[PDB]
């Protein structure tokens, strides 16, 4: 097998910024990886295309994936509303880590975050499932529009997304 590679084309207030590609660890967290992959292609009839990163905190992370409420209160998995924490094998070791947002144990939906720093305090509480493969510079650029409380200064959207591998 080969781990799937997905991409997001990011736009800032409608201006294309660049492409970020992620490697999804299907070999370690197959269910979580599959959920993110399907949501990136939109094959189930819903997904990330057109959604925004609603909360960005410099030196911490960029959060997005709420394609229903667009405010951090929505989103859903391809398995129904929410699914279990698959495993906590991987850790939040440094910049580029892709991890699942939640509202407590076993509440994974569609929201995720990209770490821009090692965030060890989230280990064992959030399921790590992939990492930035290319375009980490785009993630850094995105960080500039964030703020301490998370509010973004420009609308950061996923203009297009899909699978590459």
């Amino acid at each position: 097998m080969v781990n799937p590679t997905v991409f997001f084309d990011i736009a800032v207030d409608g201006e294309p910024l660049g492409r970020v590609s992620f490697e999804l660890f299907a070999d370690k967290v197959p269910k979580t990886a599959e959920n993110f992959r399907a949501l990136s292609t939109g094959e189930k009839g819903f997904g990330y295309k057109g959604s925004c990163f609603h909360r960005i905190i410099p030196g911490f992370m960029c959060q997005g994936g709420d394609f229903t409420r667009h405010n951090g209160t929505g989103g859903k998995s391809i398995y129904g509303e929410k699914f279990e924490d698959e495993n906590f094998i991987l850790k939040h070791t440094g910049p580029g880590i892709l991890s699942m947002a939640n509202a407590g144990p076993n509440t994974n939906g569609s929201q995720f975050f990209i770490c821009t720093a090692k965030t060890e305090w989230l280990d064992g509480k959030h399921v790590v499932f992939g990492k930035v493969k290319e375009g980490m510079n785009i993630v850094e650029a995105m960080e500039r529009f964030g703020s301490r409380n998370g509010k973004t200064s420009k609308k950061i959207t996923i203009a297009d997304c899909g699978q590459l591998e």
Partner: peptide, 11 residues
């Protein structure tokens, strides 16, 4: 604080 929740963001 620095959490990544969905609905009730905490300190």
């Amino acid at each position: 604080x620095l959490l990544v929740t969905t609905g009730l963001v905490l300190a």
